[PDB]
Curated annotation (Swiss-Prot):
Family of this protein: Belongs to the protein kinase superfamily. Tyr protein kinase family. Insulin receptor subfamily.
Entry note about domains: It is unclear whether the potential membrane spanning region near the N-terminus is present as a transmembrane domain in the native protein or serves as a cleaved signal sequence.
Name of the protein described by the UniProt record: Protein sevenless
Residues bearing attached sugar chains per UniProt: N104
Function according to Swiss-Prot or TrEMBL: Receptor for an extracellular signal required to instruct a cell to differentiate into an R7 photoreceptor. The ligand for sev is the boss (bride of sevenless) protein on the surface of the neighboring R8 cell.
Known partners and oligomeric status: May form a complex with drk and Sos. Binds the phosphotyrosine interaction domain (PID) of Dab.
Subcellular localization, as worded in the UniProt entry: Cell membrane
Length: 327
């Protein structure tokens, strides 16, 4: 306060352990880089395959990727949804058209553009476009159990993602990024930047990592939205990205740049050819850490035990939710 200083509150805390660094000789991850017309699967070995997964002549509006089923749903610019299941980077099943009911919620016409996947409830989230407003509305994989969350807004979201484990849906406009839960109870706006680009969500890190192609610098956005932090970036404007540990994937139009966010982009650690792709609006990493079922923190407390002659009623408290987690 103005007059003085209060007492000192002490706390003991340990941060998490260092992630193991895989070199250029021993990189074994797999990626899907997704274009508007050319969707391609690549393996990050020194001897890696540069193979086509799927080619669509129509422009694809948004994608959604599942880990447990390996399915890339496809939504075009018209609004007809094609469900396409793959297996390990190639065709096992073709595209199936999935029809969606409007119901009594969608009173007027609305067309789809957006795709996102919850892996805990197996529940799809899409926002709509009105031919006069942009309104988020949730349904099942089959599609009949449709009900809407939130309120319509005029600003177009360009990218929708799900952090299922912490219970959040992020929609990001050209005006702001927003944070909202799965049941429609609480709605929060995070940060105000004119035209942000692509964001990637890590659920264990609790950090939204975002690249502006207009600014061309790092930006860190937290889940409450009040924390903003830059880092030094290698210079080239990449439309999307993926993060693999301490290494950063930056796709050029002919190669891929492997940097550890301090070395230059002119000398990558390893390069993989991307010559069939025109541009990279969506870089998707195939790790099991991209969709964890593990919340990665747990210790019970307040153990109460009420006993008897030959029995006991024993009650404990669940570990509490964090503010970066949801209800
Ligand atoms: C940090 O160290 C103290 C002192 O040894 C210990 O009691 C505490 O458990 C540590 N904190 C964590 C979160 O491990």
């Amino acid at each position: 306060n103005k007059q003085g200083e209060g007492p000192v509150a002490k706390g003991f805390v340990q941060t998490h352990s260092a992630r193991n660094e895989k070199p250029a000789k021993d990189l074994t991850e797999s990626v899907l880089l997704v274009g508007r017309r050319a969707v391609m699967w690549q393996s990050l070995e020194p001897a890696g395959e540069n193979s086509m997964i799927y080619q669509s002549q129509e422009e694809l509006a948004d994608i959604a990727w599942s880990k447990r089923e390996q399915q890339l749903w496809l939504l075009n610019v018209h609004g007809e949804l094609r469900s396409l299941k793959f297996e390990s980077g190639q065709m096992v099943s073709p595209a199936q058209q999935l029809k969606l009911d409007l119901g009594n919620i969608s009173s007027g016409r609305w067309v789809p553009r957006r795709l996102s996947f919850d892996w805990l409830h197996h529940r799809l989230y899409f926002a709509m476009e009105s031919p006069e407003s942009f309104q988020i509305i949730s349904t099942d994989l089959l599609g009949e159990s449709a009900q809407k969350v939130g309120e319509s807004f005029d600003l177009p979201v360009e990218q929708l993602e799900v952090d299922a484990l912490n219970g959040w849906i992020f929609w990001r406009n050209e005006e702001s990024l927003w944070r909202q839960d799965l049941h429609g109870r609480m709605i929060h706006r995070l940060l105000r930047i004119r035209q942000p680009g692509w964001f990637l969500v890590q659920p264990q890190h609790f950090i939204i990592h975002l690249m502006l192609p207009q600014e061309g610098k790092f930006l860190e956005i937290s889940y409450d939205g009040g924390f903003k932090h830059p880092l030094p970036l290698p210079p080239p404007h990449w439309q999307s990205f993926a993060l693999l540990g301490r290494s950063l994937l930056l796709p050029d139009s002919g190669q891929l740049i492997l940097v550890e966010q301090q070395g230059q982009a002119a000398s990558p650690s390893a390069s993989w050819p991307l010559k069939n792709l025109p541009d990279c609006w969506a870089v998707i990493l195939l790790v099991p850490e991209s969709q964890p079922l593990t919340s990665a923190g747990g210790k019970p407390h307040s153990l109460k035990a009420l006993l008897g002659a030959q029995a006991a009623k024993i009650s404990w408290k669940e570990p509490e939710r964090n503010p970066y987690q949801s209800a």
